[PDB]
């Protein structure tokens, strides 16, 4: 009984959004998106995570992320929708842009 | 130097960080930290990040909003070292503030 | 809306953040925070950074190791607004943890 | 009575180090170096400061920095030397590299 509408698997809109973040992979049932970000070291990884943290608390939409030294393993979905919303793709896009710097 | 499962030093170190859970084979220690919100969790993580890069010893941590799910082990040792307990302790102290 | 020097609202807000010092013309409020070390100061600043970008209201802060010398004012207002006192309060609360 | 030796003003070594960080400016008496870093927004500035913070606590050598939204105004010197040392230029260089990303 998720209070929010999720983007339906393979919906034209979902796919139009995915196209903007092509290095993320859609998960089974299209219920989330995943990307493992790789940096040279922890210092770079934290620099990246820092910008995402600011964005996340500003839009109040947070990554499920697993950091191990130079690696940041990320899965995005909207809990209140039990799946993907526009906020996940907007978060993925910001993350992609912040990582592009490295 | 790798700490053997149930070794005297491991058990002694573990007493300094009693909220941590020894894992199968004593290959790692785990603690899940919980805060009021992400802002608090990030303030916590920020202090740990600084410590981690200073001593060059890094957590395996999974953050979701207000929680930080942490597993510590020495990657080059295939088990626990002193550095893991030292990090666990720094993390405990940083968490106390909240 | 810009708070006029010595206005009733300014003085009332100032009571919620008594460690802050009103500046000449009541154009800003200042507080210098002190911590044990940089690690603590950075943990403090990190929480404030998150708050600041959330509400889109930023401190004028000068950090040297363990100290954070802070002046707050609303750049578009040429003086103090509610947002400055709200930020001052968030900063006070973040500092309390240390 | 500074416990540490500072690099003498105009010393060949000072100048050889300054050459590596050409956008920093030497201060009167060559007692410090200064650079005002400019970013697009606070989010970028904090991303930058974050990496420098990690470096600073690792080498235990900290900037005197004044952040105002998208701007980071920095002055580096070694207090225990009452002037510049190699650590200031190594810090400036790291800062330059972290900022280059933006």
TrEMBL record, chains A, D:
Its EC number is 4.2.1.96. The keyword Protein biosynthesis does not apply. It holds the Pfam family Pterin_4a. One of its GO terms (biological process) is tetrahydrobiopterin biosynthetic process. It comes from the Eukaryota. PANTHER family: PTERIN-4-ALPHA-CARBINOLAMINE DEHYDRATASE. Keywords: Lyase. Belongs to the pterin-4-alpha-carbinolamine dehydratase family. CDD domains: PCD_DCoH_subfamily_b (cd00914). One of its GO terms (molecular function) is 4-alpha-hydroxytetrahydrobiopterin dehydratase activity. This is 4a-hydroxytetrahydrobiopterin dehydratase. HAMAP family: Pterin_4_alpha. It catalyses: (4aS,6R)-4a-hydroxy-L-erythro-5,6,7,8-tetrahydrobiopterin = (6R)-L-erythro-6,7-dihydrobiopterin + H2O.
